[PDB]
Design an enzyme around this catalytic site. Sequence first.
Site, short mmCIF file in Angstrom:
data_model
loop_
_atom_site.label_atom_id
_atom_site.label_comp_id
_atom_site.label_asym_id
_atom_site.label_seq_id
_atom_site.Cartn_x
_atom_site.Cartn_y
_atom_site.Cartn_z
N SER B 338 10.24 7.97 2.92
CA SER B 338 9.62 6.66 2.76
C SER B 338 9.97 6.15 1.37
O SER B 338 9.76 6.86 0.38
CB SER B 338 8.10 6.73 2.94
N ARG B 339 10.51 4.93 1.30
CA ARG B 339 10.96 4.39 0.02
C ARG B 339 9.84 3.69 -0.75
O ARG B 339 9.88 3.63 -1.98
CB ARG B 339 12.14 3.44 0.24
N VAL B 340 8.83 3.17 -0.04
CA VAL B 340 7.62 2.69 -0.69
C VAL B 340 6.69 3.83 -1.09
O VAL B 340 5.75 3.61 -1.86
CB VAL B 340 6.90 1.69 0.24
#
Lengths: 475, 475, 470
Positions: B338-340
């Site tokens: 997950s980049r967030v």
Amino acid sequence: DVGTVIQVGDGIARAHGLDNVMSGELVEFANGVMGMALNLEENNVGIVILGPYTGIKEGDEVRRTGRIMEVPVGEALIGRVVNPLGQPVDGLGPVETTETRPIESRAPGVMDRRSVHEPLQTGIKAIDALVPIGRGQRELIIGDRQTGKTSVAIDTIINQKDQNMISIYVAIGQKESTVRTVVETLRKHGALDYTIVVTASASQPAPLLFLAPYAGVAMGEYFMYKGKHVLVVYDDLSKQAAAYRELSLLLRRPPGREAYPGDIFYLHSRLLERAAKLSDAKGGGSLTALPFVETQAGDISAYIPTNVISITDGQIFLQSDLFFSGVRPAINAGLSVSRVGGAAQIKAMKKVAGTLRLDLAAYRELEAFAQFGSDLDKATQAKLARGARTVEVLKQDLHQPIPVEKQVLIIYALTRGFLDDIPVEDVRRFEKEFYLFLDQNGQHLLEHIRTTKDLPNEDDLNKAIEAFKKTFVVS
Amino acid sequence: DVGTVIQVGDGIARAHGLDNVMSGELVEFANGVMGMALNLEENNVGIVILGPYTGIKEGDEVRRTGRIMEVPVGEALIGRVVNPLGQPVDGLGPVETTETRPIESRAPGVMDRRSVHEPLQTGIKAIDALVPIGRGQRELIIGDRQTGKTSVAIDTIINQKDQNMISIYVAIGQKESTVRTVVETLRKHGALDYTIVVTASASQPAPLLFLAPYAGVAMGEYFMYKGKHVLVVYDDLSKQAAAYRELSLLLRRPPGREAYPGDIFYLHSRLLERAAKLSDAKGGGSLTALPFVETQAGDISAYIPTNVISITDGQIFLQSDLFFSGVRPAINAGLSVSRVGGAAQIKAMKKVAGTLRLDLAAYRELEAFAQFGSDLDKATQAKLARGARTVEVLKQDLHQPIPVEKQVLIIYALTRGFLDDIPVEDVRRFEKEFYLFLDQNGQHLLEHIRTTKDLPNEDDLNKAIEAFKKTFVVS
Amino acid sequence: MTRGRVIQVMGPVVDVKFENGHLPAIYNALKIQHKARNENEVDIDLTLEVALHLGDDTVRTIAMASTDGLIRGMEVIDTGAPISVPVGEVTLGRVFNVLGEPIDLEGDIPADARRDPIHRPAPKFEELATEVEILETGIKVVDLLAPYIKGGKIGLFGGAGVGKTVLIQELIHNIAQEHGGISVFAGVGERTREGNDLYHEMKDSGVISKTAMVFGQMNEPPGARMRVALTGLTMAEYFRDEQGQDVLLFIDNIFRFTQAGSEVSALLGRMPSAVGYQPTLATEMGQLQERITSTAKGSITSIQAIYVPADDYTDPAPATTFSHLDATTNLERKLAEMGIYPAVDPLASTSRALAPEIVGEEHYQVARKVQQTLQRYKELQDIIAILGMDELSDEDKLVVHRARRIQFFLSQNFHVAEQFTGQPGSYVPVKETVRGFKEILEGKYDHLPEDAFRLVGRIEEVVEKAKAMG
């Protein structure tokens, strides 16, 4: 019912008029060539030509014969060589057939059939012992080119000389010269008085190629409905599939996988479903089919091969490498299975082949290991010697079928270790001299096996084999 | 504005007249079925039917409603089960909605958005700790069939009962019976007072299948533009792609790769781009999307899977084999990113999950080696025991979401070696009895974590965990 | 009614023109009946199914049999409804074709018997059930490790000769005996030899009176090979709706239904799809299977036998079929060689029902605890082969000791096997199965010969048989 051609090319034509033509009809051109009427349009008829179309020209007159495709049938065709249509190829004038049958006919229903129980004797030791076949069965023979398929077919047809069988050989897309050689080989052994040959060579128009098996099956079904056993052989189904693909593409039919049409399964299923073992009410006739399929590089995994395997009641896999090694005929133990097998075999053949299978498989796996490891105990050594003798026993010379009784006798001699001290090479000559000894002495055993389909007494059989062993000399 | 049908079949029609129809309009047939007007030609209109077309006959009258596709929206739909169009499926009479929105609407611009910072609490320990999600994010859940995707979706929706979230569940191409089972499971846990269900079962016409997610996103966007948090779930996007392919092919659209049209990326991009975290000027609403994609044989490398992965802000990979082993829910550490992630997590959850990741990866690689080599030093043995306890801690029972505070408390208890002498099996019962001990004693810690979103003092927390350890009995 | 005239013929496809201004619906059935006026003509009696409207007062049809002999100007009559199948108790013990005519040589259905159309919309959302309910078959391993559920689809994966037909007939007999539920068998694209063998095997077991059979085989045209499943479905649906009893529907092969649909789409002129399949595959498969549901009055549980020619499940047909499945029973020939019947694989068989929310806690616990020991034994066997058992640990010896007995206890003396070997036949309830397995695990029946377990029903018979043997 008259019409004029408005388009022609690649073996297809379009005609004006022909207001009353029926679908599936035969039409005669002005010059005399015959064709089908496949497609009917709003104002034109599509025609498929079954011969040399070079003479057909726009403006030519076409008329309809008034009948659906009718292949002539009857006893008058025995010994002749015929087209897919009812016209001779061997010369010798006309056939003078009795009656005709439409090739496209409904197959008998379920309720109409019966289980397969009576056997088909091929005369090939390996096939009869390990992969038995019954009358009414459908078994596929698959292999690479130049592997011996046609040799097996000829060996099977010749062996039928003793029985009551009728045989039909359908050559599809084959070279005319090898067809002529096969016909002369059949005559040389005198098998032509009960066989029919239908031929469609590679040079013929594509429409004739796919129509050949339907003419063969109509000819075979003529006899079966009157209570006769029939054996039809197709040497090349894949070429029929290719010819149908060609014909479909010339009609602009959108393709499927590869570019075969969707009819591929329909074609072969509608063909092979007519082989059956009719019930006693119908008359008890039987029709056995032996289709041949040629595969590339020996890989059985392909569209047409697996498609046909989905239909047939079993398959025999012929290996090219073993064929080159000199073993004839090459058969793969792993992939060769028959689901009717075990019901057709006579009692003695079953009683001996049951042990034969175990010995062969044990030798196969042990030899597959032996190439890497040479350290073997006494038991494995005896197992290897038994396996070697077993694999030598199954060898057969070309075009010389063996009667079942001598097969069961020799395999019984093998199983009980009568070859304990005989060297490997002497085993083959042992088989020939044993056949001679049986011919001169063991006539009662042969007659008992023929009449009773059962193994004779163990003691007398062992006495006879022991006497022959006493006579036999090594090397 | 009246027209007559001149052609009909497979769910498409052509009409004469209709001189003033607008592109994208809805048209009503004589019997009452509704359809789109996709294509306008020089002298005829092409119509796509959104229901049973068996009653539509050539010569029938078709009229236009005078409006673009309008899905009704409003609070009146909460708790109901509705078609992609505004018609009920659960009975209970009409909905009496307030207003309507066109499904095909422009997404908010860049300038209009904001970074994602507030979290989404799934209630699943592994997902919350290792793969955090934030409101306004778009994360893809991908896996094989029968891997637990819908169980994770239901566990997430149920946990939203405490928060202010609004949830929407879109069933695409699913079996009606499992949709009914899911609805009754939602009611059983009382989650129906804040959810909306839009359904398009496998038996429905293909046009309704691809229109379902747009109705779902229009319904969700109605609330978000007024400052509400919304969570939309799509269980099957690939079936929407298949239905659109079917509809395109029935229009004779030339194919692309596979035979998907070029619109494949356009369709999913135009759909998933409407999930956003609106700026303070717009109102601060958020819309979170959780699309589900089913892959064959567990291979993530394919046209549709990688195509969707190109759009989403991350993905969770669910493994089938672990699902069969009894671990629920199965998650692959390597492919789940997950980049967030890291911005949404509260301080304590971050402080503990940071160590949790290292321990899990070390155990994974060490176990991947251990199956071949059993010679391990003391350090590797302690590492393996820690990893085993860690993997046991992450287990969760079905349909029982856990609040975040107990998650951070139990993971803190794990990290600091409070389970040093507790055997592996006792660990799970340790977690349950620890939850009980926290409920009776540790209320201040829970309230502090709730109000402050921070870990309490180490000394008091250790004192409480030590007291519970003193109470706990092994086996 | 209205009568049209033929204008085009090609393959199984015919086109008709109607002048009186009334045209058939999309799914209406049409019939051609012409008597040859001269030797130039042929007698024909053919049934057609409409497919499309093409304007100019013309319609397109797909034929159910060979179209040879058709002529332009030939009349076609409209029946006004789809294919009508006779339904009721009159169908039990008889064999039909697609058109609803009896193949078997036992007479014909009377004229006035009621008949229902094959095509109807699926049941709605409100009418379905709300709780997953286990279907008790009475087979120890099937009920224990991979339970069935009413209204679900069970996939049968096995080869010829591993015991498929024995299991099928045992299921039909058990469902007819206890639950009072009839069965329907539909054959789609199979060998006619296997149809004859199945008919004779059913007649030799007394089952035929409790079932109805519809057959479409390989030789049939594509349209009949497509709609045979639908006529079998409406035959079962009548029993579910009007009589309110539970029904069991068997389908011979799900693959060739999609294959025939692909062929018909290719004939109709639609643009192809991936691997040349029909574009309409998924909706057709759904329309077939979404009528197989458990409503309030009754249920239609379906067992579907799936055979993939190439053993590759990534293709669209295995993909779509597996999407609807609920449980899978896989048959293994190794256990058939071992002698265990019906030789279902305990480790490879799966069901989505094996969850405590559906089956209860004890069922799940015992299933998982048994599967642990089975997997451990499977792994341990090769170690036993390479190295002497005596040198191994006591725990491994105990695991093998329990595992062999458990594996033997999976077998059951079926009813249909009464004739090949003289056996009464045992029907086991689920609770006693669970109790027996748990007591085997704990050691109540530990000190017994492993030979006793080979073929037994409930657990007390094990002790009685062991005491008799020694």
